[PDB]
Amino acid sequence: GSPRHTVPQCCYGFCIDLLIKLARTMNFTYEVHLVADGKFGTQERVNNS
């Protein structure tokens, strides 16, 4: 779909409010970003070595 077009956009919802509650509770700043794929991540052999 999009091989190279990366922008900052507005993310919100349930777990975003959870992260805002945790940053409101615990003393830390935070960086929010997406993942480079559309996948969780599974244990798989890479096709070299």
């Binding site: 349930f14 409010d17 959870l18 509650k21 945790l22 509770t25 615990m26 830390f28 559309g38 996948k39 969780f40 991540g41 599974t42 244990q43 798989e44």
Partner: protein
């Protein structure tokens, strides 16, 4: 998520004529006997015997038709739903029920460890979808038939779209938490804050 009525019409068009013939045998008379038969067949002295016979048969015919229309509409509804994971049309599937899951999901690994799910695994490896909205739009346009996913996400999708309906089974009752690193100082107070949200209605506020 009848022809038998035409037979009844031919029979009563014989019955009214033979009733007027029996009236002619041992006596606007023709139209009077016709309109009397019009009163008889729709429920609006020897001929009166065949009249009361045909009245009894007319009531038993319309009672049987009420019975079998109720039969055709009551019992013919609930055979449409899917019986979940134990469906033999999913345990032993075919090219008809199209069911799938998200590509590289842990649900696929959960099905892969269970060695009695290899048939569904080889079914669903043909339709591994990238995102959930792919599966939503594909089942929305009748290009799918079922989808394997967690509960509350599909509950929210059923709340948004009324045509999307989940199933009745609730298996592998698991939990979602917060993914973490290894041994790290950000471990204890995070779970403490989550449980502090559990003890009050802040989880209910998020609901």
């Amino acid at each position: 998520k009848s022809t038998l009525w035409l037979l009844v019409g031919l029979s009563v068009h014989v019955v009214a004529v033979m009733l007027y013939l029996l009236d002619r045998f041992s006596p606007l008379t023709l139209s009077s006997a016709m309109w009397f038969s019009w009163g008889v067949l729709l429920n609006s002295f020897s001929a009166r015997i065949l009249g009361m016979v045909w009245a009894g048969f007319a009531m038993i015919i319309v009672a049987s038709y009420t019975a079998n229309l109720a039969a055709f509409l009551v019992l013919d509804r609930p055979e449409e739903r899917i019986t979940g994971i134990n469906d033999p049309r999913l345990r032993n599937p075919s090219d008809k029920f199209i069911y799938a899951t998200v590509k590289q999901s842990s649900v696929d690994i959960y099905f892969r460890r269970q060695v009695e799910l290899s048939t569904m695994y080889r079914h669903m490896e043909k339709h591994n979808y990238e995102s959930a909205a792919e599966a939503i739009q594909a089942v929305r346009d009748n290009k799918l038939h079922a989808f394997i996913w967690d509960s509350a996400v599909l509950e929210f999708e059923a709340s948004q779209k009324c045509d999307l309906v989940t199933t009745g089974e609730l298996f592998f009752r698991s939990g979602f938490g917060i993914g973490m690193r290894k041994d790290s100082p950000w471990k204890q107070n995070v779970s403490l804050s989550i449980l502090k949200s559990h003890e009050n209605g802040f989880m209910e506020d998020l609901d």
